[PDB]
């Protein structure tokens, strides 16, 4: 059923809450035993948000291989994403270790360091050229190279150096800075513009490791980003673009990380983004 029509039918009937609860009821349930080990307590921002054992990212260290991160592998769309929580005080070094080991080109950040008067993430990138960061626990150095600040998002060029081997890589930091403290944006125009800038960079392309995407928990805004990308890619690839069922794509993605899309407002915003984005993907 054409999603634009399904959209007006849910809107006119005001059944967004009822659709959203059907998804929660049908969503996969897999074990998260490694996340709940006592040694990993301070590696988790939220007690109710864990990666599944089958899909979790492992750090390449014999000590403790655990990070709150999941590999979302979309077989038909031919896209992979890593979804992770905002780094914590004692996991900032683990975060950059994962970026290095998985050969990611881009980091996508959908939250501000402070929201609603509380800390949502650590300040994990350097804010000045001449003041670099050193992660002694993972033996990595990080340097700000340049910064381009626009109205709805900032792009930063960073250099990450493996102090063990002295290899260096360029990482792009895509920071969406205007998601509101409560609810969702009114229009998806600036979110879609942001997604096309990430795509244009080659950060989402198969010649690199998967893109690292995060908000505070790594399931809400993070969910919205990868659901919209995958849905628009599938509308490009298939003979019948109207066959693309956004609830089916979400349930497939929820086999890899729990809780993707946190509210009925976020589900509705996901529909709007795809519906609007398709008016470029279908030839405009
Ligand atoms: C000065 C940089 C190099 N090493 C660092 N560690 C750190 C990690 C998290 C945090 F919240 C505060 C500090 S930051």
């Amino acid at each position: 059923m054409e999603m634009e029509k399904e959209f007006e039918q849910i809107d006119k009937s005001g059944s967004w809450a009822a659709i959203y609860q059907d998804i929660r009821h049908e969503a996969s349930d897999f074990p998260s035993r490694v996340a709940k080990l006592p040694k990993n307590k301070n590696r988790n921002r939220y007690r109710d948000v864990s990666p599944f054992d089958h899909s979790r990212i492992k750090l390449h260290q014999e000590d403790n291989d655990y990070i709150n991160a999941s590999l979302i592998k979309m077989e038909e769309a031919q896209r992979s994403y890593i979804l992770t929580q905002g780094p914590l005080p004692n996991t900032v070094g683990h975060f950059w270790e994962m970026v290095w080991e998985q050969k990611s080109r881009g980091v996508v950040m959908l939250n501000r360091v402070m929201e609603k008067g509380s800390l949502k993430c650590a300040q994990y990138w350097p804010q000045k050229e001449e003041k670099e960061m050193i992660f002694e626990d993972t033996n990595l150095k990080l340097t700000l190279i340049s910064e381009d600040i626009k109205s709805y998002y900032t792009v930063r060029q960073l250099e990450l150096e493996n102090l063990t081997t002295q290899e260096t890589r360029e990482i792009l930091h895509f920071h969406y800075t205007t998601w509101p403290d409560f609810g969702v944006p009114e229009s998806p125009a600036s979110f879609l513009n942001f997604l096309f800038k990430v795509r244009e960079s080659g950060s989402l392309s198969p010649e690199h490791g998967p893109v690292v995407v995060h908000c505070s928990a790594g399931i809400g805004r993070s969910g919205t980003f990868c659901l919209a990308d995958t849905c628009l890619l599938l509308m490009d690839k298939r003979k019948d673009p109207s066959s693309v069922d956004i609830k089916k794509v979400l349930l497939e993605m929820r086999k890899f990380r729990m809780g993707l899309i946190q509210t009925a407002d976020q589900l509705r915003f996901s529909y709007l983004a795809v519906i609007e984005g398709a008016k470029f993907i279908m030839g405009d």
Side-chain angles (χ1 to χ4, degrees):
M1 179 172 176
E2 161 62 0
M3 75 182 86
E4 185 140 32
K5 309 305 161 45
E6 187 197 355
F7 179 88
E8 294 184 339
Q9 184 252 295
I10 299 152
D11 239 9
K12 95 182 188 300
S13 52
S15 21
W16 281 111
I19 307 311
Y20 178 67
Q21 287 308 319
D22 294 338
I23 293 163
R24 272 172 45 96
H25 183 76
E26 288 298 297
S28 307
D29 185 15
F30 296 108
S32 294
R33 284 154 213 147
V34 176
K36 294 143 185 185
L37 292 174
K39 70 175 192 163
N40 294 325
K41 180 204 316 285
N42 76 345
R43 293 177 174 218
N44 294 307
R45 177 173 295 279
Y46 307 103
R47 165 195 52 69
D48 60 329
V49 179
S50 317
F52 296 141
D53 298 320
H54 76 92
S55 60
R56 66 176 186 102
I57 298 298
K58 305 183 181 168
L59 304 170
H60 302 174
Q61 48 178 125
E62 63 210 4
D63 178 22
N64 184 343
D65 69 4
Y66 178 75
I67 182 165
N68 199 314
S70 310
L71 186 64
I72 301 10
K73 282 190 305 209
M74 305 300 290
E75 201 185 347
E76 186 187 1
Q78 300 198 250
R79 275 274 218 260
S80 284
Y81 322 82
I82 296 173
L83 273 62
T84 194
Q85 74 180 11
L88 290 150
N90 66 267
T91 64
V92 151
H94 304 148
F95 176 93
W96 283 111
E97 175 185 11
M98 173 173 76
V99 167
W100 185 270
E101 289 165 357
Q102 305 301 312
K103 296 176 165 48
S104 308
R105 176 76 205 297
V107 176
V108 174
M109 170 163 186
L110 300 172
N111 69 286
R112 289 174 297 292
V113 165
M114 181 161 285
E115 289 179 13
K116 290 170 172 191
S118 309
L119 297 177
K120 292 303 168 202
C121 184
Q123 182 59 58
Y124 69 85
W125 65 102
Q127 294 190 279
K128 276 157 184 281
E129 281 92 337
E130 66 276 11
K131 295 292 212 175
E132 72 273 13
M133 291 199 181
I134 296 277
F135 313 101
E136 294 192 325
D137 62 332
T138 56
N139 209 226
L140 286 159
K141 183 178 95 166
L142 187 61
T143 309
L144 180 66
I145 295 309
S146 71
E147 186 154 49
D148 180 356
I149 296 174
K150 315 293 216 101
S151 41
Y152 285 114
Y153 72 85
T154 295
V155 189
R156 311 182 179 87
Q157 290 183 292
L158 308 172
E159 175 190 281
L160 179 67
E161 182 180 342
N162 177 335
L163 290 169
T164 298
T165 67
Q166 283 187 317
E167 314 159 70
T168 63
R169 287 179 203 154
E170 184 194 2
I171 309 304
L172 301 181
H173 196 245
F174 291 98
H175 187 176
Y176 189 86
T177 51
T178 52
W179 194 295
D181 273 8
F182 289 95
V184 304
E186 196 176 331
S187 146
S190 64
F191 192 72
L192 292 164
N193 183 65
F194 181 68
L195 169 65
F196 300 143
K197 301 295 191 175
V198 177
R199 280 184 173 194
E200 272 172 18
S201 80
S203 295
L204 289 170
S205 294
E207 50 260 32
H208 304 289
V211 70
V212 176
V213 0
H214 83 82
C215 46
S216 202
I219 59 161
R221 295 169 204 182
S222 288
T224 307
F225 182 86
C226 72
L227 176 59
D229 182 53
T230 283
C231 283
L232 292 163
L233 217 47
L234 288 171
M235 293 174 77
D236 273 342
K237 191 167 176 177
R238 293 185 173 179
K239 296 184 172 186
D240 180 15
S242 63
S243 68
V244 171
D245 182 350
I246 176 169
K247 294 153 307 179
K248 282 211 182 76
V249 181
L250 183 48
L251 290 165
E252 179 67 29
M253 240 153 43
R254 282 198 171 213
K255 290 163 182 188
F256 298 98
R257 186 168 182 82
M258 67 175 64
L260 303 172
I261 311 291
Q262 277 177 302
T263 75
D265 270 345
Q266 276 179 7
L267 187 60
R268 179 178 188 280
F269 178 79
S270 300
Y271 275 74
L272 278 175
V274 171
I275 289 157
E276 190 63 23
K279 303 180 214 274
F280 167 80
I281 294 314
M282 308 301 305
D284 213 316

